[PDB]
């Protein structure tokens, strides 16, 4: 009577699958089992992203998942984690969950159209900066964000929250990443009160 449903997750290490299965087993025990039975399909990260996209299509072909969870890779480069699943298992508009995605360029509902995250992005840490600033007797800020999407959006959020207080950022000094000669910007920031 309870129709079998598959909820899948890709996550590093073999051990993580054990509590994946344990947690999905615990979840159904909280409710009855005469209505729905919960299953799980798991896989582990691998370098070539094309292979991950192919395996994602093969899994959703073989599992017709209700929701897919995506993890971070243990091989640094903390940008290629939700590359394959965001747009491969997104053509059918199926919910996708990420746990550790502190990067914010995935929050725009114009490219992904299906993404839910359990960690706040860096614009919220900019809001935290504002809250710290609110009562500390500091009102003469100098932003030094880097020219990138991970920083430009934070700068825009910081600006739009500050203008609500009728205050302004004096400077928007902004240097490109990678280049290592940046001294004149500090001198520019030096010549102010």
């Amino acid at each position, epitope marked *: *009577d309870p129709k079998i449903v598959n909820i899948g997750a890709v996550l590093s290490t073999r051990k993580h699958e054990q509590m994946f299965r344990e947690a999905v*087993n615990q979840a*159904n*025990k909280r409710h*009855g*089992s*005469w209505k729905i*039975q919960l299953n799980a399909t798991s896989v582990t990260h691998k370098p070539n992203a094309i292979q991950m996209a192919l395996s994602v299509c093969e899994d959703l072909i073989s599992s017709q998942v209700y929701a897919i969870l995506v993890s971070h890779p243990p091989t640094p480069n903390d940008h290629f984690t939700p590359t394959p699943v965001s747009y491969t298992a997104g053509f059918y508009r199926i919910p996708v969950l990420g746990l550790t995605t502190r990067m914010s360029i995935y929050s725009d509902k114009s490219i992904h159209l299906s993404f839910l995250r359990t960690v706040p992005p860096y614009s919220h840490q900019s809001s935290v900066w504002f809250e710290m600033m609110r009562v500390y007797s500091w009102n003469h800020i100098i932003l030094l964000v880097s020219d990138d999407h991970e920083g430009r959006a934070a700068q825009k959020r910081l600006e739009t929250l500050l203008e609500e207080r009728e205050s302004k950022a004096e400077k928007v000094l902004q240097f490109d990443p990678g280049t290592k000669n940046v001294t004149a910007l500090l001198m520019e920031a030096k010549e102010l009160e």
Partner: antibody
Amino acid sequence: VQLVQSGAEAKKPGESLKISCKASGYSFTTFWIGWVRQMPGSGLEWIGIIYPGDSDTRYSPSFQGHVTISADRSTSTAYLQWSSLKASDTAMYYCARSAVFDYWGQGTLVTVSS
Amino acid sequence: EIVMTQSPATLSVSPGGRATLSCRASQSVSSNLAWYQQKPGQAPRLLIYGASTRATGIPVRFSGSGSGTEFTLTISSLQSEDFAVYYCQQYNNWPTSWTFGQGTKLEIKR
């Protein structure tokens, strides 16, 4: 789905028995198995519900501390053992399936007569 | 702490007639109630879960309804071959209560 219970039996007062309800229709850890009693002219009364996958058990308020509800991990049989205090509990016990008595067993007629 | 009650007494009915007996709820169970039509000399069969739906493999000659009101039988245009016993139980929260009724047995009219 299927359910087979222990055979009917009669025992003298002041003895402890055991009846094994074995499920061979679904996985042994997917549902909450239980126990109900149907004495002639009384109705249905719950005794105890146990999950064989973790041995978590609960019992009825008006029966607690009178019989044990054990289980296993490979034979997939739940043992409803009684105590010597039973003297007028002759009935036809049944084991539930998914806490809503989905698929009942064949029934175990337990008699306590002199 | 709310024992389900079945009514009215005995409701033996003629062939080609409905069977509607009351299971007036004393508590405020959210949506759960069941009757579990049973035949003496056999095991009770699953008739309704959630007091509004019907399990797979069963026709639609018996049902139920209600969320805050008294969950009642919804049997109509039935035959006389059943003549079964009808208890009524519910599970407001599980597994704690397991409240059961006494059963309004139905005979066969002629």
